Design a protein that fits this description.
Largest sheet: 5 strands, antiparallel
Protein name: TccC3
Entry title: Crystal Structure of TcdB2-TccC3 without hypervariable C-terminal region
Keywords: Tc toxin, ABC toxin, toxin
Organism: Photorhabdus luminescens
Order of helices and strands: EEEHEEEEE
Distance between the termini: 18 Å
Structural class: mainly beta
PDB class: toxin
Length: about 100
């Protein structure tokens, strides 16, 4: 999860922290425009303007800790095709949405 951004000389552009399931709980910057250009924040995946995180093979709803669609890989991570990283978001990460 992208927490700090630094410019060419190690000065803080932004500061972020997340709720364990993706939600953004702290968001700070040195300029309201300079901050609008940070795109990826949680688990190295893009939070679109829609609010969904784009993981690759699926989109993710951080506000209910739940995938937007059933796993295409099927029963690869259990019988629950909507569960998020075995409900262990602080320890585990999903690389591509499967």
């Amino acid at each position: 999860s992208s927490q700090l951004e630094l410019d060419s000389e190690g000065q803080i552009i932004s500061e972020e922290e997340y709720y364990p399931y993706g939600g953004t709980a702290l968001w700070a910057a040195r300029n309201q425009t300079e901050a609008s250009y940070k795109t990826i924040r949680y688990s190295g995946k893009e939070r679109d303007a829609t609010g969904l995180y784009y993981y690759g093979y699926r989109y993710y709803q951080p506000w209910i800790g739940r995938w937007l669609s059933s796993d295409p890989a099927g029963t690869i991570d259990g019988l629950n095709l909507y569960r998020m990283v075995r409900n262990n978001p602080v320890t585990l990460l999903d690389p591509d949405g499967l």
